[PDB]
Amino acid sequence: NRGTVDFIASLENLKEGDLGILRKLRGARLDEKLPGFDLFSALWWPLRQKNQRAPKREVAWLIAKLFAEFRFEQREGATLPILMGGICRKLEPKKELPRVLARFDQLASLDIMQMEEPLSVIMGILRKHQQVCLDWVGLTDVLSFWEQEPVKREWSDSFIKAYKI
């Protein structure tokens, strides 16, 4: 896609003031506070009116908030299941590993509205283990096409491939 790449580049073009504006609004909707709505509209609407396959409003809002609180540099080949597999194959397999596995597996039963907080938990686990990179574009596409079966199959397959190295 190209709307996603432009959206991510625009998000990384922000400075500390607008990042703080987005950071103050975690856990909130889009139609609540005017400064957040204005910032997100001015960042997203030209891309939507240009590219027909730009990310939807809810997905783009969720990625904007996650980037605000969990600022990671954009890199290719650093998807969420790969990093979760790399982290998960370092703990004992009796107590901690089933807990982290259950936390990762909760995401399959949630829709796109109720997914900011588990993703925040996963990214907090990533940040606790000295991670400084993430693939925002691939995560945005996966969240955009989520209720399908092949996307979840590829998600779990990438997790298994990272876990069984």
Partner: protein
């Protein structure tokens, strides 16, 4: 007859109950995310509290051998007592001591009289210890929280027989869920070196998760089962009910209360006398959203009052009357002034509420049951 206590309680930014990762406990109610406080946390906080100190007559410990060594302690009773209780049936699975016993602590010294003889033996001493442990349940806190004691059949010597060690709990406590969508927040602490050093990337950017929410809490007590569990001590049962209400009102979990100080008293307490338990958590199925014309707590009380009116018109039969008292401090939060008259004794004192509750319960008095105290050690 069941005594139902509903509470609306607003809290400061706090981290009262956590999980393994440090985040506050959460749940999904009505499709959205809410903050949660577990039932075991509330029950433990009530059990170990200043207003429940005179009725704490039970201990839940994994080191009964050390307790009896502290109790009797002549020369060597620790090793022999540990061996006796290990042959009783308390299995050492995976080298864990395990099998948390929950007997009343007033009988512990009597157990000393079983472990202070060098001619008794092993299996007979274990049988006597098991017999004195099984029929030791007279305690106000044990009668509320219940107890299950089922030792595994591997370390049992097949000569000691275990009697009934199961007591039905007379207290039901629900998890406390918020009345709005949870908004978790992250605090980025950094430790500072008192002695000056090198300020070149000191690091230690931490993560402390916390949240502030308006909780709905719901407790229920069965009067008949409590009296039966105490073995016919209606005085001690009335003292237990009154001191339980007094403790559950003015107490909080002790989780991270040195960094935060959310020592916030409840803004509304409803007490109802029914014949079937009823939870009013379905009031806050739609999350309460704040406006500029009111606050969070008043809207929560209003929604609760609307739902209480709905469950008081529907599901109502004269064959079982319902009597309730509403308490807010100096009547600062009336019970949803759109229909009013939902309760019958809108008052503004906690001790007057306890007194009125006791008089409805048995015509007791709060100054009379305080001398029916349990083991006060």
């Amino acid at each position: 007859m069941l005594i139902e206590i509903h509470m609306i309680q607003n809290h400061s930014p706090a981290n009262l109950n956590r999980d393994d990762l440090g985040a506050p406990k959460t749940c999904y109610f009505g499709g959205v995310l809410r903050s949660r406080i577990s039932s075991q946390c509330i029950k433990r906080s009530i059990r170990t509290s200043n207003d429940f100190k005179a009725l704490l007559g039970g201990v839940r410990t994994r080191r009964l051998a050390d307790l009896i060594q502290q109790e009797a302690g002549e020369t060597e009773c620790w090793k022999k007592a540990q061996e006796i209780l290990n042959k009783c049936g308390f299995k050492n699975k995976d080298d864990n001591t395990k099998m948390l016993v929950f007997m009343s602590k007033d009988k512990i010294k009597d157990l000393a009289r079983i472990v202070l003889d060098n001619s008794l033996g092993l299996t007979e001493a274990a049988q006597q210890v098991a017999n004195v442990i099984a029929q030791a349940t007279l305690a106000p806190d044990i009668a509320l929280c219940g107890r299950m004691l089922e030792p595994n059949d591997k370390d049992k010597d097949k000569k000691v027989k275990w009697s009934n060690t199961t007591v039905e709990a007379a207290l039901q406590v629900a998890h406390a869920i918020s009345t709005h969508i949870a908004r978790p927040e992250i605090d980025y602490f950094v430790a500072a070196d008192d002695v000056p050093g090198e300020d070149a990337g000191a690091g230690h950017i931490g993560e402390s998760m916390f949240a502030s929410a308006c909780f709905y809490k719901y407790f229920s007590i069965d009067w008949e089962q409590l009296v039966k569990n105490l073995k016919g001590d209606t005085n001690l049962a009335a003292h237990t009910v009154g001191a339980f209400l007094l403790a559950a009102a003015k107490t909080n979990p002790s989780g991270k209360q040195n960094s935060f100080a959310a020592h916030n008293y409840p803004d509304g307490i409803l007490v109802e006398f029914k014949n079937s338990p009823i939870s009013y958590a379905n009031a806050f199925v739609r999350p309460v959203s704040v406006v500029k014309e009111s606050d969070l707590v008043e809207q929560s009380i209003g929604q609760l009052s609307n739902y209480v009116n709905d469950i008081r018109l529907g599901y109502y039969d004269e064959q079982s009357p319902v009597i309730g008292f509403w308490f807010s401090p100096n009547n600062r939060y009336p019970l949803g002034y759109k229909h009013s008259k939902l309760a019958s004794r809108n008052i503004g004192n906690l001790n007057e509420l306890v007194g009125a509750v006791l008089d409805y319960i048995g015509g007791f008095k709060w100054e009379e049951v305080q001398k029916s105290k349990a083991y006060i050690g």
